[PDB]
Every structure is written in structure tokens, then in C-alpha cells.
Amino acid sequence: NANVVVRLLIRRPEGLLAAMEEAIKIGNAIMTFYAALIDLLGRCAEAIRIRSILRSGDLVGVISIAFQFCPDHKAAMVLFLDRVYVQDFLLHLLGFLPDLRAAASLTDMALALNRYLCTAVLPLLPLFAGTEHHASLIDSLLHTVKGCSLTKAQRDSIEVCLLSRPSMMQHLLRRLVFDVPLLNKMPLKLLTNHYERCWKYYCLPGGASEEELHLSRKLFWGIFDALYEQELFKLALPCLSAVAGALPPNF
Amino acid sequence: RTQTGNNTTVNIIISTVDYLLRVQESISDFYWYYSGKDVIDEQGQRNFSKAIQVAKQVFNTLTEYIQGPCTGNQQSLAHSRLWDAVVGFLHVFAHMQMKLSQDSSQIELLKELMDLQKDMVVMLLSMLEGNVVNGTIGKQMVDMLVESSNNVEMILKFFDMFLKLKDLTSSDTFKEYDPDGKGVISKRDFHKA
Amino acid sequence: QFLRTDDEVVLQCTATIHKEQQKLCLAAEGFGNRLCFLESTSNSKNVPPDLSICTFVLEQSLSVRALQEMLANTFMMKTAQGGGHRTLLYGHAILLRHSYSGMYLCCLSTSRSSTDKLAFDVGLQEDTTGEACWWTIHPASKQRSEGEKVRVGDDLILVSVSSERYLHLSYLHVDAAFQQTLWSVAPISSGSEAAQGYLIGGDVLRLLHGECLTVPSGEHEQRRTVHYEGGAVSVHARSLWRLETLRVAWSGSHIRWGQPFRLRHVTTGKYLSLMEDKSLLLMDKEKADVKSTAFTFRSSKEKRKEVDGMGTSEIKYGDSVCFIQHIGTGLWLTYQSSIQRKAIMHHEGHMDDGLNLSRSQHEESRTARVIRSTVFLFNRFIRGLDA
């Protein structure tokens, strides 16, 4: 059905892309209409020979809806760009900066915030912008610290942290240590349990902020003297202490 | 052919010629689908055998259309466009026979397509008589059979190698070559003799 | 009557440019241009277009499934695959070849036009590997069927197999859009075509005396004089002559008597422009009227019209002598008198008009059109850098 529909649409589509990006001021039905068009065309993965015709220059729409009513359109563009189409060109689009900006602003926002959680699972596939992206992800997780969808958001966050370089990861781990020691809330507890595994991954290869990591390990041991999700966080806190051993070897 | 009495004529034979042409083209399409996988599936078997029955029935019509040697029907259908489907069925025959022979379970559908070849040449032999000496029909017969003449190699190899198969498998060094005199012959020794 | 392998034809549109039938045909350049472009035949009487940079050869004709089987084998092309000569049915997929170059018609990935987005452009690549050089044929007439024979003179639709886009007449350009465009097929030279040693229309060849008909050499006039010369000037390049009739269709038929002859000289690219007010001269393409330069040949000196086929194998090369009669004047090519023996068109001629005729070879033309392709490129280069 993908093949049949795509051939009939190459027969009659009926520049559309550039002037499509106009009437935000102005009528919403044509905007959502071309959003529906790109969402339909994003529903198809020889077939490669017409994937060329799928491939037959939409990054203008991608970038124009990457940051600018709204939340259907950027979601449709995310679906299209994900299905049709490295990692540094992929992270060039940093889209989620305005989302992580307006995350903590407590209902179209309430639509978009739990909408673009599943969007952020799609970038799961060494300069400063990665550190700012990790900071914005920690900020949106602090806006999460819905909730069941925030669990998938946190799993994507742990996967993006385990994807990596490690210096920007340590710059984000500074924020993780400065945040998680206060709540030691359960979302940040599992986030620190994941960051302990990230430090366990970077321990042997990575062995100023190591003194802060040792102080955070001692503070986590002291907060473990206060006695669930905190039980699993304390079980992974043994990996945090071992990573402190092998690594040194709302505002 | 004509319906002289009615106002608008209808030449029903040319219509069913076109119908056979479309049937043939889609049989060729079925061939191109199974042309790569070559281990024919039972659903394709059960569908395609039924299609062979369809083709057999319409060749039976085309026989009994011109089985009485009425010359206007000869002049119509000989002029008619069916001759592409002739060549196409012959292609289908030659290129099916190989993998139909090479496979054990496909002997049923081989019997089907074999039978269709039989009805094919029945229809051709029926329309292939009305000749004073040569005939423009005879011209066109010979010409498009020569136009066919690549796959003819395959079907004649097929026939002779299943024919003097039967002939030579009673000959000098086979019938006694088995110890029982029964045909429990080993296949490498069979190849050798 | 129909089309098979090696039936070399043209692809021509009839555009309605300002409500006039602009019968423009597709010009395949090659050898300096990978693209394609158009070539009008409306003023064919007075601006005679070239044929040789416009034609294509029906190389192959197969179904979709057979082509995808050829694609499944990722040479020998399955021994033909097909015929024979594989008489054309609609819905076959075909290969086309610019016969002068040896290129093949492909769709581009580029955007070398307006663009006017994702609808590609027209290329001429080297090798038929991959999907870019295969062309579905569809009837542009619901009255006619797919699966029946491709008639002479069918305005039809050609769509790619790689890009699967409609071969469209852009603006004046050609592109792989999603919108249709009619395309006429005229049997130029077909098929087979016809037997050797025979005079075939649309052919580059020499012009022998029994000694040739020479042009002055390099650094001359714009070479406009016409002379005889003996010796190995046949081996020299500038002794080459390409014939054209006024026929567009069946232009690559045989050469029979008394028919029009638009003598395009090869190495100039010019025309043998008889200005019988003065003498036999040489002028450009936009000059060349019929009654300016179109000739007819008689077997004798003393002195048909149309056949829609190859015609008879009329004139051979060896034991053959033609005699040049202009239509508007009836003159006959003799000479006048370091062989710079000036040839003239004269009302009578001597006994010294007994021309023998020799053909050329493929690589000779493959050098020859390349020569002035290079020349007209670097004249642009010279003038731009002089600017």
C-alpha cells in the first residue's frame, strides 16, 4: 500500500515547502494539512528504488519546525526524518532546547511536554553542545523529578548518557552530583543510579571534580545511614563507590 | 463471426482471442514470479493448476471454433493477434519444463502443463490445414514459428532426452546390468553405462 | 510497419510554442555534454537540423519481471535475453543508445535546471549497469492497449525505472518530472539497415573524382572555397561529406536517384551552399535553403519522390557514378583550372564529372564530429579570454 500510494502521489501531489512556513501569523487547517501530508509520507520504510523518491530535501521544514498549534507539526517532521534518514550531523538540530527551556513553566505546553518524550527516544541511535544537551536533558528530567512516559524519557536519558565525550559527560555529572545529593527525587535517584554505571564505564579508562565525586560518594554513604526505590539506588550506590575507587585509580 | 441479421456486428472470437492473450500474459507474470525461487509452493501449485485448466478450456473452444474448417473463421483468427501468445506460451513451456522436471512433487503440475502443451498443439494442428499449396496462413505459420525458434531447442532437447531415455533404457547394457534384472541399478553406474 | 531491435529512430515533440507546432526533436550531444537538449525541425527548409545528434537505437526490449531478473543477477545479458529482434510491445522496458557516442539514456540525480523540486533531469551515461538506463513504454491512448505491438507513429509516454518519473518537456528543457509529455517515434533507419556496400541516407562519406573534392586547410576565409585535390587527402579529415535528404522520417533509408541532397560538409559543419549567382560556395547552417543547396543525382548527365521504407539498394560504392544536379538551377559539378583545382557548378559539365563514391568508417565520424565539437568549444574559450 506504501508503494501504491506513493506512486499515486508522485502522479499528483497538488514552492510549497517555503511558503508553507508562512501562515503561523495568520487558517490553521492548511498548516495541519501539510503536517498530515508529511506524517502520511513518513509511514513507509526494490523498495529502496522508491525510497530514493522518498529521498527526492526536506531539511528546511525540519529545521523550521525544529524550534518554533505547534506540537503536531514537529512530531510529524520527526517521524519523517527518522524513518527516511552521522551522529554529529544528527545532533546538529539542537530541537529540544526550547522544550527543555519551557519544561518547568508550571495546556498545549502540557500536550507537547509529554508528547515529545517519545520523540526524544528517536535520537538514541565531543564538543560543548553535547554538554549543553546533557544539561538540558538533566533540566527536563528535573522537570520530571506523563510520569509513566517520563520513565521512558529517563530510560532514553540513561541510554544517551551511556552512549558516550566523557569530559562533557563529567561536566553533566557535576550537575548530577550537585542535584542528586539533595534529593537523596526518585527519578533523580534512578538517574544517579544510572550515572554511577556511567562512571563505572568511564572508571578504568578514566583511571578537580574527582574530589567532588569522592565527597559525593561519602555523602551518599552518609545518606545511606538514614536507613524501595532508594533500596535499588543504594544497591547501585555500591557501584558508585566502586566507580569512585576505579575512576580515581529549580535552581 | 458476424451476425448478419443484427444491426451491430459482434465478432466474439476476437474477444476471446484477447482474453487468451491476457491470460497468457498473466501466466508469464506468474512465471517471472516463480522464476527465481524455483521451489514451487503448494498454494502457487493449487492456483496455477486451476489457471492451466482455464487455459485448457479456452484452447478447447479455439479448437471447436475452427475445428470445422470454415474458411472465414480461418481468415479471421489467422489474421488475428493471438500469435504473440503462441510464442509466449512456448516460452512458458520451455522455461517451466526444466524446473518441473528437476523437482519431485511438481510432476502433477508438469502433467497439467504437459496437457496444456498437448491441447496447444491440438489447436495449432486444427487451424494448420486449410492450404491450397502454401497459403498466406502457411507463410505466417512458418514465419512466427521461426520467430519462436530459441525455446524450440529446449523442448526438442526435452522430448528427445525423455524419448531415447525410454528407448535406451531397454538397450545393450542396462537390462542385465542390474543384478536382479529388475532395475535396482546404482545411479552412478547408471550414469556410467 | 513496426519496431524491433536495431530500429534506429528519433524522439520528437511537437510543442505548441506560441500556438505553432514547434516540431522540436531531442538532441543528444555527448563528448562535451552529458545532458540533452532540443532541436527544432519547423524551419527544416532553410535551417536544416542535424540528424546524427538526434537518433537512438532500440537496443533491447524486455518485460518488467525479466528486467528485475537481470537486476537479480548482481555480462552476457542472458544470451540476448529475448529474441531475435524482439518486436516491441507496450510495457516492455527498453535500452536506448545515442548511436554516435555510444552513451545510453539515463535519468540524472542532479538538479541542473529549474528545479522546481524533486523531479530529476536527463543524463547520458556510459554503461547500462544499474537501473538508470531502462525505459518503460506506455500507450498514451486508451484506444490502444498495453501488450500489443508498438506501431509506427505513436505519441507515447516514457517513464524511468530507477527514478520512475515522467519524461517531461520542461521550459525549453527536458526533465524527469511527474507530468507526461508525448513523444513521436519515426522509423529513420530500420531494420536491418540494410546491407553493406549500399548508399544509405544520413551517412558521412568521401567524394572521389576517379582525387577528391577538397576544402582549404587550416588557417583560412572561414574555408569557404571549394577545390579538387589528389593524393591522400582522403586520409585527411577535411575530405568528408555527410548527406541529408529533406525526409525527416526514413532519413536513414537508402539513397535513390533524383531525391533531395542537403550536403552538410562534415569538418566545417557548414553546407555546400550553391550560390549559382557566383559559384559553388560554402555557408552556414542558418543559411541553407532547399533551393540554395539541395541537390539531386542523376545516373547520366542528360536528365522518384517518396517511399515510406528503406527503398531499393539503389547505388553501390565501387561500380557507381552519380552526377550532381541542383534543383533550382540544374547545374552540374565540373572543375576549372599545387592542386587547387576549382570545382564549379556548370550547366553542362565535361566528361570529367565521373565521380566515384566511397563511404567512411565509424571511428572516422567518431573523430569527425568530435573535431568541430572541440572547435566550437574552444572558439567560445578564445573569445571569452579575449574579452
Side-chain angles (χ1 to χ4, degrees), chain A residues 114 117-118 121 147 153:
Chain A
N114 288 316
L117 297 179
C118 69
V121 185

PDB file of all heavy atoms in Angstrom, chain A residues 114 117-118 121 144 146-156, unseen atoms left out:
ATOM      1  N   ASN A 114       4.600  15.953  27.327  1.00  0.00           N
ATOM      2  CA  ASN A 114       4.512  14.501  27.295  1.00  0.00           C
ATOM      3  C   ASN A 114       4.392  13.966  25.882  1.00  0.00           C
ATOM      4  O   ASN A 114       4.461  12.749  25.687  1.00  0.00           O
ATOM      5  CB  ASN A 114       3.338  14.019  28.144  1.00  0.00           C
ATOM      6  CG  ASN A 114       3.601  14.166  29.628  1.00  0.00           C
ATOM      7  OD1 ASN A 114       4.687  13.851  30.113  1.00  0.00           O
ATOM      8  ND2 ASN A 114       2.613  14.669  30.357  1.00  0.00           N
ATOM      9  N   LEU A 117       8.335  13.353  24.602  1.00  0.00           N
ATOM     10  CA  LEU A 117       9.127  12.351  25.304  1.00  0.00           C
ATOM     11  C   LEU A 117       9.481  11.200  24.377  1.00  0.00           C
ATOM     12  O   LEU A 117      10.646  10.792  24.293  1.00  0.00           O
ATOM     13  CB  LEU A 117       8.367  11.835  26.524  1.00  0.00           C
ATOM     14  CG  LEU A 117       8.078  12.889  27.591  1.00  0.00           C
ATOM     15  CD1 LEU A 117       7.304  12.320  28.761  1.00  0.00           C
ATOM     16  CD2 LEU A 117       9.360  13.546  28.060  1.00  0.00           C
ATOM     17  N   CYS A 118       8.486  10.665  23.664  1.00  0.00           N
ATOM     18  CA  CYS A 118       8.736   9.599  22.702  1.00  0.00           C
ATOM     19  C   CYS A 118       9.508  10.091  21.490  1.00  0.00           C
ATOM     20  O   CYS A 118      10.130   9.281  20.796  1.00  0.00           O
ATOM     21  CB  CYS A 118       7.421   8.986  22.237  1.00  0.00           C
ATOM     22  SG  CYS A 118       6.441  10.092  21.214  1.00  0.00           S
ATOM     23  N   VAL A 121      13.192   9.613  22.244  1.00  0.00           N
ATOM     24  CA  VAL A 121      13.690   8.253  22.143  1.00  0.00           C
ATOM     25  C   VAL A 121      14.299   8.006  20.765  1.00  0.00           C
ATOM     26  O   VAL A 121      15.158   7.136  20.605  1.00  0.00           O
ATOM     27  CB  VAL A 121      12.528   7.296  22.476  1.00  0.00           C
ATOM     28  CG1 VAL A 121      12.961   5.837  22.510  1.00  0.00           C
ATOM     29  CG2 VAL A 121      11.894   7.691  23.798  1.00  0.00           C
ATOM     30  N   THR A 144      10.839  16.422  35.326  1.00  0.00           N
ATOM     31  CA  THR A 144      10.185  15.151  35.591  1.00  0.00           C
ATOM     32  C   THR A 144      10.470  14.615  36.987  1.00  0.00           C
ATOM     33  O   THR A 144       9.772  13.698  37.431  1.00  0.00           O
ATOM     34  CB  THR A 144      10.619  14.105  34.560  1.00  0.00           C
ATOM     35  N   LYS A 146       2.276  10.488  31.519  1.00  0.00           N
ATOM     36  CA  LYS A 146       3.155  11.548  31.987  1.00  0.00           C
ATOM     37  C   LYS A 146       4.370  10.966  32.678  1.00  0.00           C
ATOM     38  O   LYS A 146       5.432  10.836  32.074  1.00  0.00           O
ATOM     39  CB  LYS A 146       2.416  12.488  32.939  1.00  0.00           C
ATOM     40  N   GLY A 147       4.192  10.631  33.958  1.00  0.00           N
ATOM     41  CA  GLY A 147       5.280  10.044  34.722  1.00  0.00           C
ATOM     42  C   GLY A 147       5.660   8.667  34.221  1.00  0.00           C
ATOM     43  O   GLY A 147       6.837   8.298  34.223  1.00  0.00           O
ATOM     44  N   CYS A 148       4.672   7.894  33.773  1.00  0.00           N
ATOM     45  CA  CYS A 148       4.979   6.639  33.101  1.00  0.00           C
ATOM     46  C   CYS A 148       5.677   6.896  31.774  1.00  0.00           C
ATOM     47  O   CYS A 148       6.569   6.139  31.377  1.00  0.00           O
ATOM     48  CB  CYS A 148       3.702   5.829  32.894  1.00  0.00           C
ATOM     49  N   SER A 149       5.299   7.974  31.085  1.00  0.00           N
ATOM     50  CA  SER A 149       6.045   8.379  29.900  1.00  0.00           C
ATOM     51  C   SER A 149       7.380   9.000  30.283  1.00  0.00           C
ATOM     52  O   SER A 149       8.364   8.893  29.534  1.00  0.00           O
ATOM     53  CB  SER A 149       5.206   9.346  29.069  1.00  0.00           C
ATOM     54  N   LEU A 150       7.451   9.614  31.464  1.00  0.00           N
ATOM     55  CA  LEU A 150       8.729  10.095  31.964  1.00  0.00           C
ATOM     56  C   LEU A 150       9.679   8.957  32.304  1.00  0.00           C
ATOM     57  O   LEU A 150      10.892   9.170  32.313  1.00  0.00           O
ATOM     58  CB  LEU A 150       8.524  10.979  33.193  1.00  0.00           C
ATOM     59  N   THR A 151       9.160   7.754  32.569  1.00  0.00           N
ATOM     60  CA  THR A 151      10.033   6.599  32.762  1.00  0.00           C
ATOM     61  C   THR A 151      10.759   6.234  31.473  1.00  0.00           C
ATOM     62  O   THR A 151      11.959   5.927  31.492  1.00  0.00           O
ATOM     63  CB  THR A 151       9.224   5.408  33.273  1.00  0.00           C
ATOM     64  N   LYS A 152      10.052   6.283  30.342  1.00  0.00           N
ATOM     65  CA  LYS A 152      10.698   6.072  29.051  1.00  0.00           C
ATOM     66  C   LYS A 152      11.653   7.208  28.730  1.00  0.00           C
ATOM     67  O   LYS A 152      12.707   6.989  28.118  1.00  0.00           O
ATOM     68  CB  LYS A 152       9.645   5.936  27.954  1.00  0.00           C
ATOM     69  N   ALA A 153      11.295   8.426  29.142  1.00  0.00           N
ATOM     70  CA  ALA A 153      12.202   9.560  28.993  1.00  0.00           C
ATOM     71  C   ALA A 153      13.492   9.349  29.777  1.00  0.00           C
ATOM     72  O   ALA A 153      14.587   9.633  29.279  1.00  0.00           O
ATOM     73  CB  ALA A 153      11.507  10.841  29.444  1.00  0.00           C
ATOM     74  N   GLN A 154      13.386   8.808  30.989  1.00  0.00           N
ATOM     75  CA  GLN A 154      14.568   8.571  31.808  1.00  0.00           C
ATOM     76  C   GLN A 154      15.392   7.406  31.283  1.00  0.00           C
ATOM     77  O   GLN A 154      16.623   7.422  31.397  1.00  0.00           O
ATOM     78  CB  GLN A 154      14.162   8.314  33.257  1.00  0.00           C
ATOM     79  N   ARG A 155      14.737   6.395  30.706  1.00  0.00           N
ATOM     80  CA  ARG A 155      15.478   5.305  30.081  1.00  0.00           C
ATOM     81  C   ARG A 155      16.243   5.797  28.856  1.00  0.00           C
ATOM     82  O   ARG A 155      17.398   5.410  28.640  1.00  0.00           O
ATOM     83  CB  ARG A 155      14.529   4.169  29.711  1.00  0.00           C
ATOM     84  N   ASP A 156      15.625   6.684  28.069  1.00  0.00           N
ATOM     85  CA  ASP A 156      16.329   7.306  26.952  1.00  0.00           C
ATOM     86  C   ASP A 156      17.469   8.192  27.440  1.00  0.00           C
ATOM     87  O   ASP A 156      18.523   8.265  26.802  1.00  0.00           O
ATOM     88  CB  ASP A 156      15.349   8.110  26.099  1.00  0.00           C
TER      89      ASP A 156
END
